[PDB]
Amino acid sequence: NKGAIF
Amino acid sequence: NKGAIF
Amino acid sequence: NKGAIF
Amino acid sequence: NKGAIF
Amino acid sequence: NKGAIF
Amino acid sequence: NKGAIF
Amino acid sequence: NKGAIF
Amino acid sequence: NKGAIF
């Protein structure tokens, strides 16, 4: 799993 | 902003 | 911003 | 798993 | 089981 | 089991 | 500007 | 500017 929060 | 990836 | 990836 | 928060 | 609360 | 709370 | 590539 | 690549 991969994610970005920005 | 807030997030979850799983 | 806050996030979790797992 | 990989993630970025910024 | 997996979960996120935010 | 895996989880995040934030 | 902000971005994520993954 | 801010970014993540992964």
UniProtKB/Swiss-Prot annotation, chains A, B, C, D, E, F, G, H:
It comes from the Eukaryota. This is P3(40). The gene is APP. The chain holds residues 698 to 703 of 770 of the full protein.
